[PDB]
Design a binder for this molecule. Structure first.
Ligand code: ZN
Lengths: 40, 48, 656
C-alpha cells in the first residue's frame, strides 16, 4: 500500500511542488527492449 | 625538459559538457536473497 | 544481541581500484613532410589525428571528466591518470643497438634535404626534426603503464599512445616504427621485477605481422608471442618468411612462438572467435603466465580500406573479455594500427567498456560459418602445436609426432573394388522396389548395371535422364587416436529423390552411372567414357523410339561433359527441352556448337547450372557455359536439398 501511494505521488502529481537515471526502476535493462517491438 | 613544450597562456574554450556516464553495469550492486523462515522445515527423527 | 562475526574491510583487491590511463598532448607533433598531392587522396598510413579522437570519444560517454580535452588530473571516479615520462636511453638500449640510437641522434639535428633523403632511404618510414623526443615518450610511458599494473595501483591499464612500436627491429627501423614499444617494456619489467612477473604472454591483432618484437624474443622462454595477420607470401606487407605459420621459435625459444595467418583477405568475427576458443585459451592456460600484454591494432575492423575485414567492435569486446579471464587480472593495452577513425573510435569505446568491467554485448550475427581456408589453416597450425605443446595432443588426436611417410602406393594391384559394390547395392535396392531394367550395351567394355531403365520405356512419353557418378561416402574418424572407421560410414544417395519424384508422376526414368578412374586428379578418361556412352545411347535407342517427347536431363557432380558433348556433337533440340546440373566444385563445361550456332543461344535459354559458394570463380562468367548460379552453401548434398524445389519447379515449368 505504501509503495503504491509513493509511486502515485512520484508520478504525475497535482498542483504544487511542495513535497513532489541509475537506478533505472523504469524497466530499462535494455536487451530486446526496443527490439522486441516490431520496429517496422 | 622537452623541446616540444607548448606555450600559450590562454583559457581553452570548452568542447564537451559533463553528463551522466552511459554505462549500465557496475555502479550497481549484486542482489542477495535470504530469510531464516526457510529454516523452519526440518526432519522428524524416526528410526533411532 | 550477541555478536558472532565482526565488521571489517572487504578483503578484495580487484575493483576498488580504477583503470590506469596514459595520454598526453605531446605525441601529436611528429609528422610527415609534404612530397606529392597523392597524400591528399591517400589513407595517410600513420596520422597523428588518431589519439585525440579516442580521447574525445572516451570523454563523450562519461568515462573521462574533462570538458576541454587536455591532459588533466581530475579524470573522474572510474579511471586514474598515469603520469607520462620519456624513457631513458638505457632502457631503449636494453633491446636496441647503440648505432640505431646514434642514427636517431643524427636524425634529430639534420637539415631538410638530409631528412628527405632519409625518408626516401629507409624501409617505409619517415622522419622529422621533432622525432627524437616524440620517440622517447611512448615506450617509457608504456613502461609507466605496466608499472601501475604490477604494483597494483590500478586494475588494468590502457595507454593510448602513438607512434606504433611493433615493426622496428633491434638493428634497424621499419614500417613507420622508430623504437619498440612492447618488447622494451616487457624487458624493463622482467629486469626490474624478477620476483612478481615470471611469464609474459603477448598478443597481436594488428593485421600486419609484428616482426620486430617477434625477433626481439625469438630465442627466449619468458615471453610467449602470438600474432594474427594475413600472410600472402610475397605481396602483402611485409611478406617475409618470419611471418610464416611454421616459424616456431628457435633454440630455447622453441615452443614459445605462434603465428596465425589468414590465407585470404576478408575474414569476419567468427574466425576470430573460432581461433580463440579453439587455440589461444588452452595454450594460454598451459603457459600459466603472470602478465598478458596486448599490441592492439584496429586496422582489421569493418569499414577499413586497407585490410578489408569485418570485425565489429562486439568481437573486440569478446576478445578482451576472454583475455581478462586469462590472467589473474593484470593487463595493459597499447595501440599499434588504425586507418579509419570511426572504426577505431567504436573499437576503443568497446574495449574501454570491457576494461572497466562491463560485460561485452552480443554478436551482430552468430550464424556465419567461417571460411574453410581458416579451418584448414588452423588444422595445419594444430599439427605443429601438438608437436610442441601437450594439451592439443589426444584431444585432436594427433598422437605425438605422427608425421606420416606412408600412404605408399605399391600394392595397388591388390585392392577392394568398392565401386561395383556401391553400384551393385544401389542396383539391388532400386530393382527390389522399382524393377528397373538393366538395359545392355554392346561393343563397349563396361559393367552390366551401367544404365538402368524403366520397364515399358517404349510407351513412355516424357523420359528424363539422370547421370551420376558413384555417390558420396561420409566416414567417421575415431576420436581417441588417428584413423578412420570404415564400418561406421554411410553412403549418401543423391539422385533418388529426383528419381522418386519422376516415378510418382509416371515419367520415363533412365539412369546412368559413370565410375571414377583411380589415381587421377581429374576424371578425364571418365569424361571420355561418358561422352562415348552418351553418344551411344542417344544413337542406338532414343532416335528409334516412336512415342517420345519433352526430354530432360539431370546432371550431377562431374560427368556433365557427357550431356554437353551430346548437345554439341548432335542436334536434338526438337525433342528435348531443358537440362539441369548441380556441378558442385569441379571445372566448368564449355559447350562447343557444331551442328548450328543458334544452338548456343538455345542452350543458354533453357538451362541452369548450380555451383558452390566457394568456387574458384567469383573473385561475369562467359556465356559459353550457359547460366551458372552461385548458391550460398557448400557440398552437393546441401545445394540439392536446398534448391530441389526450384529445380523441380523449373522442370514442371518446362512442360505443358
Ligand atoms: Zn598495422
Amino acid at each position: 500500500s505504501m509503495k503504491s501511494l509513493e509511486n502515485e505521488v512520484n508520478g504525475p502529481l497535482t498542483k504544487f511542488s511542495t513535497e513532489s537515471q541509475n537506478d533505472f526502476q523504469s524497466l530499462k535493462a535494455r536487451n530486446k527492449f526496443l527490439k522486441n517491438y516490431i520496429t517496422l | 625538459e622537452n623541446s616540444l613544450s607548448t606555450t600559450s597562456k590562454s583559457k581553452r574554450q570548452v568542447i564537451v559538457p559533463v553528463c551522466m556516464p552511459k554505462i549500465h553495469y557496475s555502479p550497481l550492486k549484486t542482489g542477495l536473497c535470504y530469510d531464516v523462515r526457510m529454516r523452519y522445515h526440518a526432519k522428524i527423527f524416526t528410526s533411532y | 544481541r550477541q555478536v558472532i562475526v565482526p565488521v571489517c574491510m572487504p578483503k578484495i583487491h580487484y575493483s576498488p581500484l580504477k583503470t590506469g590511463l596514459c595520454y598526453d598532448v605531446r605525441m601529436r607533433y611528429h609528422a610527415k613532410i609534404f612530397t606529392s598531392y597523392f597524400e591528399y587522396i591517400d589513407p595517410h598510413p600513420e596520422d597523428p589525428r588518431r589519439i585525440y579522437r579516442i580521447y574525445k570519444i572516451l570523454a563523450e560517454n562519461g568515462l573521462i571528466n574533462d570538458p576541454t580535452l587536455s591532459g588533466v588530473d581530475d579524470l573522474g571516479d572510474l579511471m586514474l591518470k598515469i603520469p607520462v615520462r620519456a624513457a631513458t636511453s638505457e632502457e631503449i638500449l636494453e633491446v636496441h643497438t647503440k648505432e640505431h640510437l646514434e642514427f636517431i641522434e643524427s636524425t634529430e639535428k639534420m637539415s631538410r634535404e638530409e631528412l628527405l633523403k632519409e625518408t626516401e632511404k629507409g624501409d617505409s618510414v619517415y622522419f622529422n626534426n621533432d622525432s627524437y623526443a616524440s620517440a622517447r615518450l611512448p615506450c617509457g610511458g608504456a613502461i609507466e603503464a605496466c608499472k601501475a599494473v604490477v604494483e597494483g595501483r590500478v586494475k588494468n591499464s590502457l595507454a593510448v599512445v602513438r607512434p606504433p612500436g611493433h615493426h622496428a627491429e633491434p638493428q634497424a627501423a621499419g614500417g613507420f616504427c622508430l623504437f619498440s614499444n612492447v618488447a622494451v617494456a616487457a624487458k624493463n619489467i622482467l629486469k626490474n621485477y624478477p620476483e612478481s612477473v615470471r611469464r609474459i604472454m603477448i598478443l597481436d591483432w594488428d593485421i600486419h605481422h609484428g616482426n620486430g618484437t617477434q625477433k626481439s624474443f625469438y630465442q627466449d622462454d619468458q615471453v610467449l608471442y602470438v600474432s594474427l595477420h594475413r600472410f600472402e607470401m610475397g605481396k602483402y606487407y611485409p611478406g617475409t618468411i618470419q611471418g610464416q605459420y611454421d616459424q616456431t621459435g628457435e633454440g630455447k625459444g622453441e615452443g614459445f612462438n605462434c603465428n596465425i595467418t589468414w590465407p585470404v583477405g576478408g575474414v569476419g568475427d567468427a574466425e576470430y572467435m573460432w581461433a580463440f576458443e579453439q587455440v589461444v585459451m588452452p595454450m594460454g592456460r598451459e603457459f600459466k603466465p603472470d602478465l598478458v600484454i596486448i599490441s592492439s591494432g584496429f586496422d582489421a575492423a569493418d569499414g577499413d580500406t586497407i585490410g578489408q575485414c569485418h570485425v565489429t567492435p562486439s568481437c573486440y569486446g569478446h576478445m578482451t573479455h576472454m583475455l581478462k579471464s586469462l590472467a589473474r587480472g593484470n593487463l595493459c593495452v597499447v595501440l599499434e594500427g588504425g586507418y579509419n577513425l570511426d572504426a577505431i573510435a567504436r573499437s576503443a569505446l568497446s574495449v574501454a567498456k570491457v576494461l572497466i568491467g562491463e560485460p561485452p554485448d552480443e554478436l551482430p550475427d552468430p550464424l556465419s560459418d567461417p571460411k574453410p581456408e581458416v579451418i584448414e589453416m588452423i588444422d595445419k597450425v594444430i599439427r605443429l602445436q601438438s608437436k610442441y605443446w601437450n594439451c592439443f595432443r589426444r584431444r585432436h588426436a594427433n598422437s605425438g609426432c605422427n608425421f606420416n611417410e606412408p600412404l605408399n602406393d605399391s600394392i595397388i594391384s591388390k585392392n577392394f573394388p568398392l565401386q561395383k559394390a556401391i553400384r551393385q547395392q544401389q542396383q539391388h535396392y532400386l530393382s527390389d522396389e522399382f524393377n528397373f531394367v538393366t538395359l545392355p550395351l554392346v561393343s563397349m567394355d563396361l559393367p552390366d548395371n551401367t544404365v538402368l531403365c524403366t520397364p515399358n520405356i517404349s510407351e513412355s512419353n516424357t523420359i528424363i535422364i539422370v547421370v551420376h557418378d558413384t555417390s558420396d561416402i561420409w566416414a567417421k574418424r575415431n576420436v581417441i587416436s588417428g584413423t578412420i572407421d570404415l564400418s561406421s560410414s554411410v553412403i549418401i544417395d543423391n539422385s533418388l529423390d529426383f528419381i522418386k519424384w519422376g516415378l510418382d508422376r509416371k515419367y520415363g526414368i533412365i539412369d546412368v552411372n559413370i565410375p571414377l578412374t583411380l589415381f587421377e586428379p581429374d576424371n578425364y578418361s571418365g569424361m571420355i567414357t561418358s561422352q562415348e556412352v552418351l553418344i551411344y545411347l542417344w544413337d542406338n535407342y532414343i532416335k528409334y523410339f516412336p512415342s517420345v517427347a519433352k526430354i530432360a536431363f539431370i546432371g550431377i557432380g562431374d560427368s556433365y561433359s557427357g550431356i554437353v558433348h551430346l548437345l554439341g556433337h548432335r542436334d536434338t533440340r526438337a525433342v528435348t527441352k531443358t537440362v539441369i546440373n548441380f556441378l558442385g566444385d569441379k571445372q566448368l563445361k564449355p559447350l562447343v556448337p557444331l551442328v548450328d550456332e543458334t544452338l548456343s543461344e538455345w542452350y543458354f535459354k533453357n538451362s541452369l547450372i548450380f555451383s558452390n559458394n566457394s568456387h574458384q570463380c567469383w573473385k561475369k562468367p562467359r556465356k559459353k557455359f550457359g547460366r551458372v548460379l552461385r548458391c550460398d552453401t557448400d557440398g552437393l548434398n546441401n545445394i540439392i536439398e536446398e534448391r530441389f524445389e526450384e529445380a523441380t519447379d523449373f522442370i514442371l515449368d518446362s512442360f505443358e
